[PDB]
């Protein structure tokens with residue numbers, strides 16, 4: 001009775017594990033009952049927190065709560081993009097011979113970690129999630145990366161797996177795994193043109209692939225700084241303005257209040273994908289003032305309409321580079337947690353002239369699903 | 380099933396500079412610096428004076444082998460002077 005291998009979507013903001021068993025993929029829920037886990041690691045006076053536990057105390061402990069390690073893995077400290085990203089992180093990044101390290105306070109001491117060490121802690125959590133479900137230690141894994149990751153980013157992602165005690169069977173591209181989840185290598189219809197529209201929490205990736213006989217990238221486009229976080233921030237700014245009108249106070253320079261507001265906005269945003277209205281409550285938001293309100297789906301769409309519309313531009317750009325008309329895309333695939341937004345789905349569908357789009361696998365799970373299939377094939 | 384991720388051996392580039400587009404085709408064993416040299420022949424500007432942009436990181440060097448960048452078949456770049 002041999003141990004299964006797992007597929008891990010090691011995401012910028014959330015990660016997800018699957019396993020293929022008994023002819024079927026299982027996307028594995030953690031001990032909160034949740035099938036995605038925040039790619040977050042936190043360091044306190046007493047312990048190391050991973051996932052939800054880390055993301056839950058980010059407002060109280062921002063200096064020692066690490067995230068976005070995927071923006072650093074395999075990178076050089078002197079990279080302009082790295083230096084640009086560092087201005088937005090509340091944690092310290094330092095230079096070790098042109099290699100960035102994240103520096104925090106941990107059990108009273110100053111400790112510094114390589115990006116692949118931070119990511120190895122996320123991968124450890126994903127490994128432990130799989131082990132709790134399967135009932136035995138897991139040693140083999142496929143891990144996914146963006147198609148545009150270079151050799152150094154791939155090697156450092158694999159290193160993060162080895163540090164977590166995994167045999168990395170293979171690093172594969174995220175859009176490949178998404179296509180695998182939809183059986184797009186198995187249509188039996190000859191060569192197919194596939195567009196992957198991947199809108200997550202921090203990044204937007206458009207990939208055009210051809211697939212023929214299990215052989216899979218013709219063009220890419222997107223925005224590494226457009227994602228669900230930006231939709232959260234449109235809501236934040238909206239309620240900052242509402243708070244000024246109701247109480248004549250400006251909370252935007254209170255970092256704890258803004259982060260607490262951001263958390264609540266992200267939850268309301270998720271609710272707005274299933275309901276047309278959502279309520280929001282934060283006790284002692286600012287100067288002990290309770291904040292409580294609601295927002296409609298329509299109002300949220302209006303606050304984000306330019307951002308939503310901007311997603312079509314990389315689609316047009318990728319189609320131009322691939323020298324393909326939109327009608328020559330045989331399979332359209334929507335993945336990433338933000339593609340659950342109904343307005344986003346409708347804009348893509350209208351753009352592709354009413355076409356029914358591949359959405360029955362949960363879009364924040366399809367990459368782990370395809371990684372799990374690849375893993376089983378390699379055992 | 381069997382799953383193969385094929386890296387194209389010939390890379391197509393459309394490089395934008397001001398009003399103008401320069402097409403470049405080379406093997407993925409070539410370096411980024413060889414793109415810049417082709418740009419110098421087409422634009423008559425020294426490679427020393429061009430900032431070649433469009434890569435996904437900011438650590439790409441003239442010596443970087445294109446295969447290591449896992450590029451798509453068709454690429455869009457642009458030049459700043």
Ligand SMILES: Nc1ncnc2c1ncn2[C@@H]1O[C@H](COP(=O)(O)OP(=O)(O)O)[C@@H](O)[C@H]1O
Nearest residue numbers: 011012013014200201228270273336337338364
């Ligand atoms: N029901 C939902 N409605 C709207 N957005 C959602 C929903 N569920 C998740 N998201 C968003 O998806 C983003 C993360 O997507 P995901 O693909 O899981 O992570 P990553 O960015 O790591 O790829 C977050 O911004 C999250 O708020």
Ligand SMILES: [Mg+2]
Nearest residue numbers: 009011014015
């Ligand atoms: Mg993800």
